[PDB]
Amino acid sequence: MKAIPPKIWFETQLKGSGLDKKFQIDELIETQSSVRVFANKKYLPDTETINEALTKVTAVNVSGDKSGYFQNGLPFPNEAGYFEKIPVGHPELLSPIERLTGSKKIVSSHSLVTASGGYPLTNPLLPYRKPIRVSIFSLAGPSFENNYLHYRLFLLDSVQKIIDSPLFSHLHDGLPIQFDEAKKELGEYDTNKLMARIRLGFPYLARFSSGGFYPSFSKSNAIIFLSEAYFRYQLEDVSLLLASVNQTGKETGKAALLKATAVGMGFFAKIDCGYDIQHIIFPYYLRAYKKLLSEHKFPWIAKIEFPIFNEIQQEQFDSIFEDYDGPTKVYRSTRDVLEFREEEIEKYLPAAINPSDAFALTGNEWGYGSVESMIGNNSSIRFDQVHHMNPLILDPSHHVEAQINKDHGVELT
Amino acid sequence: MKAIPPKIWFETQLKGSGLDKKFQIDELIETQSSVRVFANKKYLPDTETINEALTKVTAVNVSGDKSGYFQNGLPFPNEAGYFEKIPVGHPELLSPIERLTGSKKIVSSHSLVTASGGYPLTNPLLPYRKPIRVSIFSLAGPSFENNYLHYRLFLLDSVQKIISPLFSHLHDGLPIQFDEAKKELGEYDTNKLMARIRLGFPYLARFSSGGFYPSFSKSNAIIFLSEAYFRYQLEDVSLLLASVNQTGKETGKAALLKATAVGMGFFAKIDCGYDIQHIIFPYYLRAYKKLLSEHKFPWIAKIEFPIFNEIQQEQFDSIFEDYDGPTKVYRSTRDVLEFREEEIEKYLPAAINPSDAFALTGNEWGYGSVESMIGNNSSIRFDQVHHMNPLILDPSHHVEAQINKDHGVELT
Amino acid sequence: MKAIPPKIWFETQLKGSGLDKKFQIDELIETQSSVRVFANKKYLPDTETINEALTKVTAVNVSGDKSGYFQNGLPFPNEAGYFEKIPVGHPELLSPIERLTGSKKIVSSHSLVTASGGYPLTNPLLPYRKPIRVSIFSLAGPSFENNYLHYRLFLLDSVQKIIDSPLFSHLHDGLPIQFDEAKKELGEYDTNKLMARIRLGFPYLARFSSGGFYPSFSKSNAIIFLSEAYFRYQLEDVSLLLASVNQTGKETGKAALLKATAVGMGFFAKIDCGYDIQHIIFPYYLRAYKKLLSEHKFPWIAKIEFPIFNEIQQEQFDSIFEDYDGPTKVYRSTRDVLEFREEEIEKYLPAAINPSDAFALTGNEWGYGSVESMIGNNSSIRFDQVHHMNPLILDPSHHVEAQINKDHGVELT
Amino acid sequence: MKAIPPKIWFETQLKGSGLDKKFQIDELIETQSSVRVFANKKYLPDTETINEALTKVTAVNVSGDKSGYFQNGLPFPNEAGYFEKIPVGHPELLSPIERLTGSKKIVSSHSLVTASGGYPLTNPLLPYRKPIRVSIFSLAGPSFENNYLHYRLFLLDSVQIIDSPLFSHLHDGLPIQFDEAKKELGEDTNKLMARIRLGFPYLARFSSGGFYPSFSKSNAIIFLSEAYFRYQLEDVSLLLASVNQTGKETGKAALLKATAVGMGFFAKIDGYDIQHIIFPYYLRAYKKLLSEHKFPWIAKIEFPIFNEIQQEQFDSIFEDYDGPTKVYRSTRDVLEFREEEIEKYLPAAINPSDAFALTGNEWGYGSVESMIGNNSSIRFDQVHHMNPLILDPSHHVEAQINKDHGVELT
Ligand SMILES: Nc1ncnc2c1ncn2[C@@H]1O[C@H](COP(=O)(O)OP(=O)(O)OC[C@H]2O[C@H](O)[C@H](O)[C@@H]2O)[C@@H](O)[C@H]1O
Ligand SMILES: Nc1ncnc2c1ncn2[C@@H]1O[C@H](COP(=O)(O)OP(=O)(O)OC[C@H]2O[C@H](O)[C@H](O)[C@@H]2O)[C@@H](O)[C@H]1O
Ligand SMILES: Nc1ncnc2c1ncn2[C@@H]1O[C@H](COP(=O)(O)OP(=O)(O)OC[C@H]2O[C@H](O)[C@H](O)[C@@H]2O)[C@@H](O)[C@H]1O
Ligand SMILES: Nc1ncnc2c1ncn2[C@@H]1O[C@H](COP(=O)(O)OP(=O)(O)OC[C@H]2O[C@H](O)[C@H](O)[C@@H]2O)[C@@H](O)[C@H]1O
């Protein structure tokens, strides 16, 4: 009912959750000073815009903005379209286009981890005898939960007949961006090299011009996924990721063991929060690693472990990486994000992706309702990567600036 | 080819399935504690037998035992009669007779439902905006898919001339031998107790070599003991109605019951390609009409029969044109798990899961049948499978049902 | 389009068909003197009614009065319902009720037969080297081809809810005659010991209130067949036939080999000329023989051969006659009506049923369109059993008066 | 028990059926003389080979050679593999491969029809007031009912490469080995092949020989979709040419009922319906051929379609279409026509037939062919026992199908 000051609302959640009893004063000083923000320069060109991306967010945000809390603790309004109508320059909240461009960053900390597991219902909470430290790289992947985030970059349909987003125009260079021309180019096929109709198994995913989605056995209204443009987006994300992991291992003097969590393959892969696109987009996530790991050494990333639990995903992995030559070892597992053996921790920098949200504080929801929230409950990440608790995330000396060349080489600061 | 511990195998299927994506641990605690097992005392007379019926099954069972997986993940053997030969008291698997007596239970749970549709290829899968709750009653009807389950109670032929003593009450003055059945019929095909199976004008016939074929001759044509089947259906449906009614009373709301055509699909095909649903459906329907005409179910407001087949549609209309009773009866072409927000507010949503007495609830993991569609659109694999919900094995979650001579059902 | 005198028209068809070239003058006088009319006196009480039955008929009549010719050569009118409206006492034509009472007679002759076969498309014309003589008994069975002949005696439906035929009320004594009540007595089941819903294999045969027939999966609207009434009808026809065949053997000094053709089981078993109920009535045909042959003596009937070509019929025969203990030998064959071999002709009186029409001249159609027309082409039956050619059929000394007691014993004149 | 001379056996079945009751000797002389055999010369190049395709068959064949009767009335032998081992040249029966090449013919006849409906139990048997005449074109589609007919031309699995060499043009430019084809798809469909989707599960076959649903891509079979398309283009262009020719000789344009040949019993592997996979290539063969050639004696083509997926695929594939022959779908039984249509048009219909049974096949009402066999005079017109004219070269039409898919006739 009444709005609370945001720091005080956040610390009220730390007390209620019990997380303010897990970590000692001196431990939080260590993990908090290790915070880094790797910002893609093309999208986050200076200290003001980075710090706007980190602060002009809600506190809890799920179901594609349909429910959650503002930083002052008041609930989202019941009026749909509230967040899609936010203009650039709003004083408190990122606009849609600023949520896309502000997604081109990675926040890392060498955080304390007291437990692993707990999120998927069948994955028990397993406490560590004593806390370990993992470098956690928070990466907010493409979201398809609503119609006005990355839906606007990678889908052609009867309501969104053209792609319009000049800031991401490089993603569509030489690629079709109009719905009708795309249907003719495909002909009587579902796929070509640059694009593919979406199948949910056998039926098509279609959208009425009215606006609502529906499965159909007809090609006519079947939405088309701009797969090569999505692949170009992933190459920007994974490029930044591997560069900032490699750099973290270098500064530590230990090669990384990286848990390549399936960013964006869960909640973010559900168009309208109900049509699972994961089997379509996941191969391009995997091919973005394969391309980068075959063209660069990453001498301080020793091995990349892909936690993969679904049989189709597993065989997509085995198929994409049958070829894989590169020096970094790549392999899949059914092990939890935050589970490491004591032997690997002595040998490698333990590192893991937090599949995050560019419009919520790090940790997002306070239950075990997602991977990020699980991590937010098993680690010090809400102290280390939330500006209310760690002002250093706002300090420019904790920002690394990233320039992604055309070969996808990354130069850091 | 290495065995996995059954709970761990199940959890692995759950984890990879992704069906639980919208389930909250707070809700699963609720749904799982709602689980009940209504066991016909005549066939399932103690905790041990009920719990054996719940657990000594396969994980997945395709095509009436033709293939699948055991709970340890290992495939079915490539050898015929393997399941037919299982004796009572086998350490892991129910025997054929135990599969018959073990379908005299009903497993229910007020499960979460996240989508409806999906099973028949033509039936679009449709996500709910917000997960709803439906009390889902799992009932494995008679199976004719192979010839060593319910085929042995309701059909006479030249391979099984007469061929079960715990079901002897199902044949009162009903003949027992194939040759005697042919004589009592004479030149006709039907009396008040049995009937040959018309596929149209030809009959269904069995070579003494096994294997079925159409025939205009009456000498190999099989004979269906329709009265024993009707009595069996009265035992299922009265247990069903009593379970639904008692469930309504406990939540203090009358039920909207989806009366799924249990046993009218995969379970109604003999030898791959001989559908007999047009002959058995009326006795399924008349079971309801008798019980609804002789009893008040004050906590069942209405029973909607989803019916997609013209013959079934006409058989329903003709059977219930008499119908007067208080609980309303009608038919639709609506998906079993599709309910309107208005009906959820007014009624306990209820639906039958047409299940399998030899597989874990949900059975197959695709969308290849009504049960597995339900197993993917709901939390039923968390609520009605002992690996995830040990409450189902707990005698405080069992209701013992005694079905009397007037078919009244006394509960616990 | 101009009327011809009936005897002249009949002779034009005899010449047109080649029938006038087949028999010698003196042979035809012998065959013509043998004509007999066995008339059930309960229905045909005097010479005048018997002669009206024989003469007040069409020339050819098929499809339940839809097609054919009058005896003056004109085509039937287009008025649907013309024959249904014919009153008792019309100058030239039997009324529907007189057509029922009129089929309680049998017209026989010891006729010449020049060939067997020719009718069913699979049954080849087989000439005899020399013409033989067969005693041919013309018997018009129940017809269901339209709604206003025997349909009025044995069927209950939504438009014909009660059977109102006082002349046939002994057939229905103590039996149900009202549709609604009958559905109630049948109840859940399809078959009484007195009635049965009609099934065309799996579906029901039903009739709308608006008059039309249709197959249905519902038992509401399903027409009900009064099987016990029809059985009592068959006992009248069959005891008149055996009595008259028996008497014919007696006057010949030889015992009959009777070809018991399946009268009423072809064209006449098709309700509306489209819905075959042959499989329902045939058992009552066979049971009439089995009853009568078991309870009465026929010392001039050596054996009875049932030509039966349909597999169900065959199995109905075998099942109905397994129990048969009576003195006269009964069996089935697939041999043509008129086909006898030399030794049978010498040992026995060859006898055969002509399944006739009570409202056409004997022979009926002139092609090979039916059992009757086949006989009509292979034999002298059109010279012998048609009054234009043989006025003796009109002479009361050629009429035999048959009385049928309660026991179904028959006294003749 | 004891063999019967085949002509005698067939007449026995006919006489007991009752189906000829409204047929007149005079009419049968006409229907029988209308018989024609349109043979693709590429597969049936002479009178001898055509007459062998017509006569060296079983009488009735149930469930893909599982049960039936030979033309002498004896049952099938209780020996699995009997029919797969029939050799080329056997004295009485076609080998599997001759069963494939023997499918490339169409037997037509302007037959009497006394009723429509009956086959699907749900479909009412409705007698015509008077018998009509319908030019019925018997065409046997690909059979996938067992593994040794057309399964060998179009599927790849773990239990075998395609082996059949007179159908090599169907594969000219397409791959021929299961393992290597698994690697092309990599991560399920390309321009020439596709895995079979039952939904999210694939259809798999393990080496033991059975079929089973699977989420794994390792025993999942694979469909030479482009090979099948080229096969359908041979069938449909023969079908359209012969229908067009029959119109031209009657002086009437055809109303063709384009029955969903091969999409029912013939689409079931092992109960594993693949109809949703193959039906679009059947439809696309009509669309291609009708857009690129003229059939001045085909007025319109009514596709009877009863399944929601088929209907949506039809609407989608023919949305584009603007050829001059009208195309539309219906839910009307094959043999059901209106008075006005019979008068205006040449009624015409595909009988989805069997290449290894006498036309009509089973004698119940358990399929479209056997429904047609009971509702028409097709058993008198298109079976050599009753109509020796079907064996006469003057009733055979030689079809030559060029590479543009135009068809020259005789
Ligand atoms: N314990 C686990 N260990 C490793 N991987 C896992 C685990 N559990 C699930 N996964 C895999 O990790 C995949 C991704 O899990 P998701 O949490 O849905 O991430 P998103 O990027 O799609 O959605 C981001 C939003 O959800 C949150 O609210 C954020 O704050 C955002 O609002 C899962 O599908 C599994 O494949
Ligand atoms: N979406 C639907 N909603 C309601 N009813 C439906 C629906 N789809 C079909 N039906 C009707 O519901 C009827 C029954 O559907 P079936 O799945 O064959 O149930 P069974 O009792 O015969 O076989 C149970 C076995 O199959 C499974 O593997 C189980 O695990 C068992 O192994 C259908 O015929 C339709 O009339
Ligand atoms: N060659 C044969 N030999 C013996 N029986 C035969 C033969 N051919 C057929 N049948 C059997 O004989 C059965 C009856 O033959 P039907 O000709 O239909 O007589 P109806 O009594 O029903 O119709 C009488 C009307 O047809 C005429 O126009 C009359 O004049 C009437 O108008 C057939 O079904 C066969 O089982
Ligand atoms: N009344 C109908 N009218 C039009 N189409 C229909 C109708 N009924 C079903 N269909 C549609 O048309 C398809 C029915 O075709 P099918 O009879 O299964 O023929 P096949 O080519 O698959 O197999 C032929 C074999 O079965 C026989 O024994 C033959 O002798 C062969 O042995 C259905 O799938 C419907 O879409």
**DSSP letter string over D313-358?**
HHHHHHHS---SSEEEEE---TT---HHHHHHSEEEEEEE--TTB-
d(C-alpha D158, C-alpha D160), whole Å: 6
Report DSSP letters for C193-238, one per residue.
SS-EE-BSSSSEEEE-TTS-EEEESSSTTB-EE-HHHHHHHHHHHH
For residue A359, the ligand 1 atom closest to its alpha carbon is: 32
Strand ranges inside A244-398, DSSP E: 256-259, 270-271, 275-276, 301-307, 329-333, 349-355
- The contacts of residue A235 (CB under 8 Å, 6+ apart) are A288, A291, A292, A408
Contact C202 D125 (CB under 8 A): no
Smallest Cβ–Cβ distance between B11 and the set A122, A267, A310 belongs to A122
d(C-alpha C358, C-alpha C133), whole Å: 24
**Exposure of B59 by Cβ count < 10 A (0-12 exposed, 13-18 middle, 19+ buried)?**
buried
d(C-alpha C374, C-alpha C358), whole Å: 17
Tell me, in angstroms, the distance from the centre of ligand 2 to residue D267's CA.
22
Closest residue in A to B17 (Cα) is A310
Nearest one of C249, C245, C250, C261 to C293, comparing CA atoms: C245
Smallest Cβ–Cβ distance between D215 and the set A202, A217, A311 belongs to A311
Which residue type does D237 have?
S
Contact B364 D213 (CB under 8 A): yes
- Torsional sign, CA A388, A394, A400, A405: positive
Closest residue in A to D281 (Cα) is A188
> Are B117 and B335 within 8 A, CB to CB?
yes
Closest residue in D to A203 (Cα) is D199
Q: What angle do CA A159, A164, A165 make, to 5 degrees?
A: 135
Q: Whose CA is nearest to atom 10 of ligand 4?
A: D368
Contact D67 B213 (CB under 8 A): yes
Nearest one of B245, B312, B251, B324 to B285, comparing CA atoms: B312
Smallest Cβ–Cβ distance between C123 and the set D15, D18, D125 belongs to D15
Give, for D180, the enclosing helix (H) or strand (E): helix D178-185
Nearest-10 crossing angle of helices D275-292, D225-250: 50
Contact A218 D190 (CB under 8 A): no
Place of tokens 């035999």: C400
Between the two ends of chain D, the Cα-to-Cα distance in Å is 44
d(C-alpha C78, C-alpha B173), whole Å: 59
At A132, give phi and psi (nearest 5°): -110, 180
Distance from CA of D167 to the nearest CA of A (A): 25
d(C-alpha B290, C-alpha A410), whole Å: 77
> Are A243 and A412 within 8 A, CB to CB?
yes
At C231, give phi and psi (nearest 5°): -65, -40
- CA B317 vs CA A137, A365, B198, C156, C191: distances in Å: 64, 53, 21, 22, 21
Residue B261 CA from chain centroid, whole number: 9
- The contacts of residue D22 (CB under 8 Å, 6+ apart) are D112, D114, D131
Nearest one of D356, D351, D358, D352 to D99, comparing CA atoms: D356
Q: Reading across the β-sheet that carries A126-139, which strands appear in turn?
A: A329-333, A301-307, A256-259, A349-355, A126-139, A105-116, A36-40, A399-404, A410-412
Nearest-10 crossing angle of helices C278-295, C227-252: 50
> Are B379 and B112 within 8 A, CB to CB?
yes
Which ligand has its closest atom nearest to the C-alpha of B121? 2
- Torsional sign, CA B196, B197, B201, B205: negative
Nearest one of D387, D327, D307, D302 to D110, comparing CA atoms: D387
**Exposure of B122 by Cβ count < 10 A (0-12 exposed, 13-18 middle, 19+ buried)?**
middle
Query: C211: left (phi > 0), else alpha (psi -120 to 50), else beta?
Result: left
Joined tokens for residue C308: 């039966």
d(C-alpha D224, C-alpha D172), whole Å: 12
Question: What b/e readout covers D245-272, taking b as 16+ CB neighbours within 10 angstroms?
Answer: bbbbebebbbbbbbbbbbbbbbbbbbeb
d(C-alpha B365, C-alpha B60), whole Å: 8
C50 bridge partner residues? none
Smallest Cβ–Cβ distance between A121 and the set B16, B28, B121 belongs to B28
d(C-alpha B202, C-alpha B220), whole Å: 12
Strand-strand pairing, B36-40 and B105-116:
antiparallel
Tell me, in angstroms, the distance from the centre of ligand 1 to residue A87's CA.
29
Nearest one of A189, A187, A190, A296 to A246, comparing CA atoms: A296
> Are A121 and B28 within 8 A, CB to CB?
yes
Put simply, the chain D residues between 102 and 161 with a CB less than 8 A from any chain B CB are: 118, 121-122
Residues of C within 8 A of B217 (CB-CB) are: 311, 315
Domain assignments of chain B as residue spans, ordered by start:
6-145+229-411, 151-225
Q: Reading across the β-sheet that carries B398-403, which strands appear in turn?
A: B328-332, B300-306, B255-258, B348-354, B126-139, B105-116, B36-40, B398-403, B409-411
Put simply, the chain A residues between 239 and 298 with a CB less than 8 A from any chain D CB are: 283
Q: What angle do CA A387, A390, A393 make, to 5 degrees?
A: 65
**How many helices and strands in chain B, by DSSP H and E?**
12, 18
Residues of C within 8 A of B318 (CB-CB) are: 217-220
Joined tokens for residue C91: 């100058």
Query: Beta-carbon neighbour count of residue B369 at 10 Å?
Result: 20
- CA B366 vs CA A279, B374, C15, D269: distances in Å: 16, 10, 78, 18
- CA C398 vs CA A28, A156, C36, D267: distances in Å: 130, 96, 5, 69
Which residue type does B211 have?
G
Chain D neighbours (≥3 Cβ pairs under 8 A) are A, B, C
Query: D301: left (phi > 0), else alpha (psi -120 to 50), else beta?
Result: beta
Nearest-10 crossing angle of helices A311-321, A278-295: 30
Tell me, in angstroms, the distance from the centre of ligand 4 to residue D101's CA.
21
Distance from CA of A282 to the nearest CA of D (A): 10
Contact B278 C202 (CB under 8 A): yes
Q: What's the length of chain A?
A: 413
- The contacts of residue D75 (CB under 8 Å, 6+ apart) are D67, D68, D69
- The radius of gyration of chain D from alpha carbons, rounded to an integer in Å, stands at 21
> Are D348 and D246 within 8 A, CB to CB?
yes
> Are D193 and D132 within 8 A, CB to CB?
no
Q: Whose CA is nearest to atom 16 of ligand 3?
A: C266
d(C-alpha B11, C-alpha C27), whole Å: 98
Q: Do chains C and D touch (3 or more CB pairs under 8 A)?
A: yes
Which residue type does D282 have?
Y
Strand-strand pairing, C196-197 and D60-62:
unpaired
Joined tokens for residue C56: 């007040």
In the 3-class helix/strand/coil scheme, how is D43-74 assigned residue by residue?
Answer: CCCCHHHHHHHHHCCECEEECCCCEEECCCCC
**Exposure of A301 by Cβ count < 10 A (0-12 exposed, 13-18 middle, 19+ buried)?**
buried
Pocket residues for ligand 4 (CB within 6 Å)? D 119-120, 123, 141, 259-267, 304, 306, 333-334, 352-354, 357, 361-362, 367-370
> Are A23 and A385 within 8 A, CB to CB?
no
For residue D335, the ligand 4 atom closest to its alpha carbon is: 3
At A111, give phi and psi (nearest 5°): -100, 160
- Residue B63 DSSP class: T
Structure determination technique employed: X-ray
Joined tokens for residue B89: 């008291």
Largest CA distance in chain D: 65
d(C-alpha C49, C-alpha C82), whole Å: 22
Nearest one of B128, B131, B162, B141 to B31, comparing CA atoms: B131
> Are B185 and B225 within 8 A, CB to CB?
no
d(C-alpha C171, C-alpha C237), whole Å: 13
d(C-alpha B67, C-alpha B44), whole Å: 27
- Residue B322 DSSP class: S
Smallest Cβ–Cβ distance between A219 and the set D190, D276, D316 belongs to D316
Query: Beta-carbon neighbour count of residue A346 at 10 Å?
Result: 8
Largest CA distance in chain A: 65
- Residue A81 DSSP class: T
Residues of A within 8 A of D191 (CB-CB) are: 189
Which ligand has its closest atom nearest to the C-alpha of D371? 4
Place of tokens 């059949």: D164
Q: Whose CA is nearest to atom 10 of ligand 2?
A: B370
Please check whether residue D189 touches A, CB under 8 A. Answer: yes
> Are D109 and D389 within 8 A, CB to CB?
no
Residues of B within 8 A of C219 (CB-CB) are: 318
Which residue type does D143 have?
S
Report DSSP letters for A159-209, one per residue.
SS-B---GGGGGGGTTS--BHHHHHHHHTT-SB-SS-EE-BSSSSEEEE-T
Q: What angle do CA D338, D344, D345 make, to 5 degrees?
A: 85
Pocket test for ligand 1, best of A139, A267, A365 (most atoms within 8 A of CB): A267
Question: What b/e readout covers A183-198, taking b as 16+ CB neighbours within 10 angstroms?
Answer: beebeeebbeebbbbb
Which ligand has its closest atom nearest to the C-alpha of B357? 2
> Are C176 and C226 within 8 A, CB to CB?
yes
Which residue type does B128 have?
Y
Nearest one of A354, A355, A351 to A328, comparing CA atoms: A351
Joined tokens for residue C289: 């023989």
Contact B318 C188 (CB under 8 A): no
Q: What's the length of chain C?
A: 413
- What percent helix, strand, coil does chain A show, rounded to 5? 35, 25, 45
Closest residue in D to C272 (Cα) is D129
- Residue B390 DSSP class: G
Task: Please enumerate, as own/partner, the contacts of B181-185 that have beta carbons within 8 Å and a separation of 24 or more.
Answer: B181/B156, B181/B223, B182/B218, B182/B219, B182/B223, B185/B218, B185/B223
For residue D123, the ligand 4 atom closest to its alpha carbon is: 1
Instruction: Determine if ligand 3 sits within 6 Å of the CB of residue C265.
Output: yes
At D84, give phi and psi (nearest 5°): -70, -25
**Exposure of D24 by Cβ count < 10 A (0-12 exposed, 13-18 middle, 19+ buried)?**
middle
Please check whether residue C312 touches B, CB under 8 A. Answer: yes
- The contacts of residue D10 (CB under 8 Å, 6+ apart) are D59, D71, D358, D383, D385, D386
Pocket residues for ligand 1 (CB within 6 Å)? A 62, 119-120, 123, 141, 261-269, 307, 336-337, 355-357, 360, 364, 370-372
- CA B313 vs CA B317, C98, C190: distances in Å: 6, 45, 19
Place of tokens 């007469």: B162
Query: Beta-carbon neighbour count of residue A9 at 10 Å?
Result: 18
> Are C151 and C130 within 8 A, CB to CB?
no
Q: What's the length of chain D?
A: 410
d(C-alpha A255, C-alpha A245), whole Å: 9
d(C-alpha C393, C-alpha B411), whole Å: 83
- The radius of gyration of chain B from alpha carbons, rounded to an integer in Å, stands at 21
Nearest one of C101, C139, C32, C50 to C401, comparing CA atoms: C50
> Are D64 and D142 within 8 A, CB to CB?
no
Contact A121 B21 (CB under 8 A): no
Strand-strand pairing, C105-116 and C126-139:
antiparallel
> Are D381 and D109 within 8 A, CB to CB?
yes
- CA B210 vs CA A258, B143, D79: distances in Å: 61, 18, 13
Q: What's the length of chain B?
A: 412
